[PDB]
């Protein structure tokens, strides 16, 4: 048996709606289930569907089923950062095991109210001569690339300061090479034109 | 619990000297544990087979026991059935002229 989900991955801006597809055998259908699989969690069932033409809804999420052509679509309206997850589709027939698709991985990029892109150098708290560079406060159009060197660069990360209703993106670069400086650390990424580089 | 109904008969019309099958059909009984023997002149016949246990719409069981045999004028055949609903084994004689 073959369950096919598409796309493999997709990215949407917070507030935009999205949808993806699950293709499954057109014969001997017994049930279809959809799961949400967040990072650092396990798959959690969202919907089970058995009736052709039926529509299921939970919150902003909904699903449809067409058994004749073997298709199910999952819809998310007004997507939120919390929706970022791998969505799995599974198909039941006259058997005791389900056929799982390989999943669609959704990334919902948060809205950044007031971007203030900048690269800051941070000093170690104890041992001397150690440092890292913090690229921070850019909006979600910015993409961070790996270095072309033996320099280490993490991916974009979002932190949320709940009480202040504030969110910000950041990436961290570090290295112990003599040439490594925050002026050059993120050279392999296309950075906002007005990124702030503090003086000495 | 329900007691068995017993029929003893040949597969084909009997003719002395001609090969045939001797049947004992037990039906309508419950529970399924049952003891069935085919007898020739009062002695148990050794190579007897039986069908696979099945049951009717009312859940009562039925079984066919059978062996190849060649009837003659003088030899007597019978079925012997024991079951928990019976106080003693019940013997039914084969009567070809029924």
């Amino acid at each position: 048996l073959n369950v096919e989900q598409s796309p493999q991955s997709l990215h949407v801006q917070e507030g935009d709606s999205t949808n993806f597809t699950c293709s499954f055998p057109s014969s001997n259908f017994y049930a279809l289930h959809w799961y949400r699989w967040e990072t650092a969690k396990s798959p959690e069932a969202l919907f089970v569907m058995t009736l052709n033409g039926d529509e299921k809804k939970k919150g902003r999420i909904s699903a449809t089923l067409n058994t004749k052509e073997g298709y199910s679509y999952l819809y998310i309206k007004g997507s939120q950062p919390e929706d970022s997850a791998t969505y799995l589709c599974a198909f039941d027939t006259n058997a005791g095991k389900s056929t799982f698709g390989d999943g669609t991985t959704l990334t919902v990029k948060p809205n950044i109210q007031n971007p203030d892109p900048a690269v800051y150098q941070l000093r170690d708290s104890a041992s001397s001569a150690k440092s890292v560079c913090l690229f921070t406060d850019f909006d979600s159009q910015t993409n961070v690339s790996q270095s072309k060197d033996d320099v280490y660069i993490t991916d974009k990360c979002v932190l949320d300061m709940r009480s202040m209703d504030f969110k910000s993106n950041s990436a961290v670069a570090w290295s112990n090479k003599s040439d490594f400086a925050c002026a050059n650390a993120f050279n392999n990424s296309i950075i906002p034109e007005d990124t702030f580089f503090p003086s000495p | 619990q329900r007691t068995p109904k017993i029929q003893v008969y040949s597969r084909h019309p009997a003719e002395n000297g001609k090969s045939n099958f001797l049947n004992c059909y037990v039906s309508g009984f419950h529970p399924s544990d049952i003891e069935v023997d085919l007898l020739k002149n009062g002695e148990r016949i050794e190579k007897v087979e039986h069908s696979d246990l099945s049951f009717s719409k009312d859940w009562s069981f039925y079984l066919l026991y059978y062996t190849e045999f060649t009837p003659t004028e003088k030899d007597e055949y019978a079925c012997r059935v024991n079951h928990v609903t019976l106080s003693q084994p019940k013997i039914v004689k084969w009567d070809r002229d029924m």
Partner: protein
């Protein structure tokens, strides 16, 4: 005509003698075609009709895996039912299960079945709508509530209305000569004296398939339902069936009685008289 596929499962506990005995058998119409016996050496679903031996190794592998799962489920059920009815471990008990499907002359779905008995008595059955359950008693209510909450019927309905019918169609095509046949009964009549003023007329039907048949006696054209002894239809052992019906008549009046035979293999019903 119409056709059917039925599977029959029996599990019997045997206190002090090990695990319960499980036997499964499958039928198309009145023709058995597979069996499984938990006590046999093979531990496989086995063919019981020549036409099913056409199936390949994947079929037999798959049917063996599935029936072994059935076996263990009904083993658990025996223990569960013992608790539901607050019974001791001293007695032998029986769980029975039947399921399957009927099709009409177009071989399209007609009806599905799925039902259980405990110790020879109805326990729970799926209703004809394939959506609700009939619970015999208070213990079956526990099962009903569990199977309702778990949506068992919605999954069973996919098998009974779809998969079951597909298999039946396949079997009917692959066993055409055996399964799509009709053998009309050979008929005759016998005459025995009961007393000096009474006699038995026995009407015979032999070598017929399928098992469905009707035998009735008439006296001057009038049904004699009350005074007619019927016997259970019985297998000859070669794929055909036998049956007889008897009536006690006053000696010398044998000419007033007629036996009537209805069978799917007869263009018209037969009338028989004592000669």
């Amino acid at each position: 005509g119409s056709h059917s596929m039925r599977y029959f499962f029996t599990s019997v506990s045997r206190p002090g003698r090990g695990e319960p005995r499980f036997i499964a058998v499958g039928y198309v119409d009145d023709t058995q075609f597979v069996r499984f016996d938990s006590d046999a050496a093979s531990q496989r679903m086995e063919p019981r009709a020549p036409w099913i031996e056409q199936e390949g190794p994947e079929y037999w592998d798959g049917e063996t895996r599935k029936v072994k799962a059935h076996s263990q489920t009904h083993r658990v059920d025996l223990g569960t039912l013992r608790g539901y009815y607050n019974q001791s471990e001293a007695g032998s008990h029986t769980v029975q299960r039947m399921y399957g499907c009927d099709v009409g002359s177009d071989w399209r779905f007609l009806r599905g079945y799925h039902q259980y008995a405990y110790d020879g008595k109805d326990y729970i059955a799926l209703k004809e709508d394939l959506r609700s359950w009939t619970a015999a008693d208070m213990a079956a209510q526990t099962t009903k509530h569990k199977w309702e909450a778990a949506h068992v019927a919605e999954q069973l309905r996919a098998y009974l209305e779809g998969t079951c019918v597909e298999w039946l169609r396949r079997y009917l095509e692959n066993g055409k000569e055996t399964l799509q046949r009709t053998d009309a009964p050979k008929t005759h009549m016998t005459h025995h004296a009961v007393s000096d003023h009474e006699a038995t007329l026995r009407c015979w039907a032999l070598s017929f398939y399928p098992a469905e048949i009707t035998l009735t006696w008439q006296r001057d054209g009038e049904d004699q339902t009350q005074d007619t002894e019927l016997v259970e239809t019985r297998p000859a052992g070669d794929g055909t069936f036998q049956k007889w019906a008897a009536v006690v008549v006053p000696s010398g009046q044998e000419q007033r009685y007629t036996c009537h035979v209805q069978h799917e293999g007869l263009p018209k019903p037969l009338t028989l008289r004592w000669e």
